[PDB]
């Protein structure tokens, strides 16, 4: 019944990364937006910058866009971290 458009990306960072460089957070935000814009129209992009698992959520216009994003990003490397990407479970908050 739910056609999932929201992708949850994990291990993109650790919140300590933002302790001693105030610019890293927005650099990461835009890195993600630039990459994800190739997968579909982005409706909302959020970084949970105090979440210990390094979490981001990207919501797309179409569920096929979320699928393409998940296919391309899961297991990819970002700043020395191997990230995961999965469809939102519809219930967990970050």
């Amino acid at each position: 019944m739910r056609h999932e458009r929201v992708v949850i990306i994990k291990n993109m960072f650790h919140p300590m990364d933002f302790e001693d460089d105030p610019l890293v957070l927005n650099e990461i935000r835009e890195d993600l937006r630039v990459e994800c814009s190739k997968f579909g129209q982005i409706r909302k992009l959020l970084l949970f910058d105090r979440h210990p698992d390094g979490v981001a959520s990207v919501s797309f216009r179409d569920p096929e866009e979320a699928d393409y994003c998940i296919q391309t990003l899961d297991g990819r490397w970002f700043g020395g971290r191997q990230i995961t990407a999965q469809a939102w479970d519809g219930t967990t908050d970050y």
Partner: peptide, 6 residues
């Protein structure tokens, strides 16, 4: 960018 840095 940080994309793909291992």
């Amino acid at each position: 960018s940080r994309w793909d840095v291992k």
